[PDB]
Design an enzyme around this catalytic site. Structure first.
Site, PDB file in Angstrom:
ATOM      1  N   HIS A  69       0.802  -1.239   0.000  1.00 21.49           N
ATOM      2  CA  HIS A  69       0.000   0.000   0.000  1.00 21.49           C
ATOM      3  C   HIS A  69       0.816   1.260   0.000  1.00 21.49           C
ATOM      4  O   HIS A  69       0.366   2.321  -0.494  1.00 21.49           O
ATOM      5  CB  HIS A  69      -0.938   0.041   1.178  1.00 21.49           C
ATOM      6  N   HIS A  96       5.777   6.463   6.567  1.00 25.69           N
ATOM      7  CA  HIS A  96       5.411   6.020   5.237  1.00 25.69           C
ATOM      8  C   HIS A  96       4.983   7.210   4.424  1.00 25.69           C
ATOM      9  O   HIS A  96       4.853   8.307   4.957  1.00 25.69           O
ATOM     10  CB  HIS A  96       4.246   5.007   5.340  1.00 25.69           C
ATOM     11  N   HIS A  98       2.647   8.863   0.793  1.00 26.87           N
ATOM     12  CA  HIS A  98       1.632   8.680  -0.271  1.00 26.87           C
ATOM     13  C   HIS A  98       2.088   9.504  -1.392  1.00 26.87           C
ATOM     14  O   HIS A  98       2.650  10.572  -1.144  1.00 26.87           O
ATOM     15  CB  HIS A  98       0.261   9.161   0.244  1.00 26.87           C
TER      16      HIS A  98
HETATM   17  N1  LIG Z   1      -0.100  -1.380   6.817  1.00 34.68           N
HETATM   18  C1  LIG Z   1      -0.469  -0.034   6.635  1.00 34.68           C
HETATM   19  N2  LIG Z   1      -0.600   0.820   7.683  1.00 34.68           N
HETATM   20  C2  LIG Z   1      -0.970   2.090   7.298  1.00 34.68           C
HETATM   21  C3  LIG Z   1      -1.168   3.188   8.308  1.00 34.68           C
HETATM   22  C4  LIG Z   1      -1.064   2.972   9.704  1.00 34.68           C
HETATM   23  C5  LIG Z   1      -1.233   4.012  10.664  1.00 34.68           C
HETATM   24  C6  LIG Z   1      -1.512   5.348  10.248  1.00 34.68           C
HETATM   25 CL1  LIG Z   1      -1.762   6.679  11.430  1.00 34.68          CL
HETATM   26  C7  LIG Z   1      -1.620   5.531   8.864  1.00 34.68           C
HETATM   27  S1  LIG Z   1      -1.971   7.153   8.241  1.00 34.68           S
HETATM   28  N3  LIG Z   1      -2.003   7.261   6.553  1.00 34.68           N
HETATM   29  O1  LIG Z   1      -3.242   7.705   8.907  1.00 34.68           O
HETATM   30  O2  LIG Z   1      -0.860   8.113   8.802  1.00 34.68           O
HETATM   31  C8  LIG Z   1      -1.449   4.497   7.906  1.00 34.68           C
HETATM   32  C9  LIG Z   1      -1.108   2.225   5.889  1.00 34.68           C
HETATM   33  S2  LIG Z   1      -0.771   0.739   5.206  1.00 34.68           S
HETATM   34 ZN   LIG Z   2      -0.390   7.786   5.651  1.00 34.41          ZN
END
Ligand SMILES: Nc1nc(-c2ccc(Cl)c(S(N)(=O)=O)c2)cs1
Ligand SMILES: [Zn+2]
EC number: 4.2.1.1
Length: 261
Positions: A69, A96, A98
């Site tokens: 993802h 991570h 996007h």
């Molecule tokens: N395995 C995966 N975990 C996430 C994830 C987990 C915690 C959080 Cl807080 C987030 S986000 N985009 O709100 O910051 C994404 C995506 S894909």
């Molecule tokens: Zn995120």
């Protein structure tokens, strides 16, 4: 009863999947994320002071993985944050991103209607003290940076960008060359201005337990660093479908306000 996926990635995959407007869990409620931030409409709150960082400067060798993802680095509680109007210290769990392949559509948040080329999330969880009193709106603290194309290499980002080559397929991992969280951050002045609001995770189960921080100023990467994310990562093991547009559609503010430092 299987995977979830992003809008783009539904017409290309082979397992059946839920598209954003069809994700289950808490995804279809009223205090969701991300949002549009109308910068003028967010009232200044004075308790929104500077953030303090522990462990951010420390060099390390991060495990980074393609989870199908996003690309995620595991921070294993080895860094922490305080300040920024927060009730307590928060331990860094993972970072991570996007992105898209077009400068106008890779970010999850937007500012006064503008979307950026990528958006970086550093996910913290609130400190367990030696007390706990008997649906926490702030269990998790996300620090969010918008990324735009600058004219120079961000050398800070280079061990992450190089490690992309070693994790093209979902479920692959690797180890980055030595680096710090500080290397990916902008200088501290660029850190003084940011927006705050209560929201959710932007991926299922979309739990409404995130205190959000979105920094007013973008980070800069070179165009070619941005491009390596869609050029090296895949949504599929077969490596036909390029990982891009891993972004959730905007959600309505509803009864929320956004404040700012
Ligand atoms: N395995 C995966 N975990 C996430 C994830 C987990 C915690 C959080 Cl807080 C987030 S986000 N985009 O709100 O910051 C994404 C995506 S894909
Ligand atoms: Zn995120």
């Amino acid at each position: 009863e299987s995977h979830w996926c992003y809008e783009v990635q539904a017409e290309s995959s082979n397992y059946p999947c839920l598209v954003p407007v069809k994700w289950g869990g808490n995804c279809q409620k009223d205090r969701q994320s991300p949002i549009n931030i109308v910068t003028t409409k967010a009232k200044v709150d004075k308790k929104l002071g500077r953030f303090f960082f522990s462990g951010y400067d420390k060099k390390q060798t991060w495990t980074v993985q393609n989870n199908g993802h996003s690309v995620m680095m595991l921070l294993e509680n080895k860094a922490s944050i305080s300040g920024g109007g927060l009730p307590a210290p928060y331990q860094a769990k993972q970072l991570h991103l996007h992105w898209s392949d077009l400068p106008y559509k890779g970010s999850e948040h937007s500012l006064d209607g503008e979307h950026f080329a990528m958006e970086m999330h550093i996910v913290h969880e609130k400190e367990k003290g030696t007390s706990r009193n008997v649906d926490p709106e702030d269990e998790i603290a996300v620090l969010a940076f918008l990324v735009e194309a600058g004219t120079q290499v961000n050398e800070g980002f280079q061990p992450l960008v190089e490690a992309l080559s070693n994790i093209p397929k979902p479920e692959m991992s690797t180890t980055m060359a030595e680096s710090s969280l500080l290397d990916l951050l902008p200088k501290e002045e660029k850190l003084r201005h940011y927006f705050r609001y209560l929201g959710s995770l932007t991926t299922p189960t979309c739990d409404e337990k995130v205190v959000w921080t979105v920094f007013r100023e973008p980070i800069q990467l070179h165009r070619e660093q941005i491009l390596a994310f869609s050029q090296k990562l895949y949504y599929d093991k077969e490596q036909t479908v390029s990982m891009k547009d891993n972004v959730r559609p905007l959600q309505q503010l509803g009864q929320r306000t956004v404040i700012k430092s």
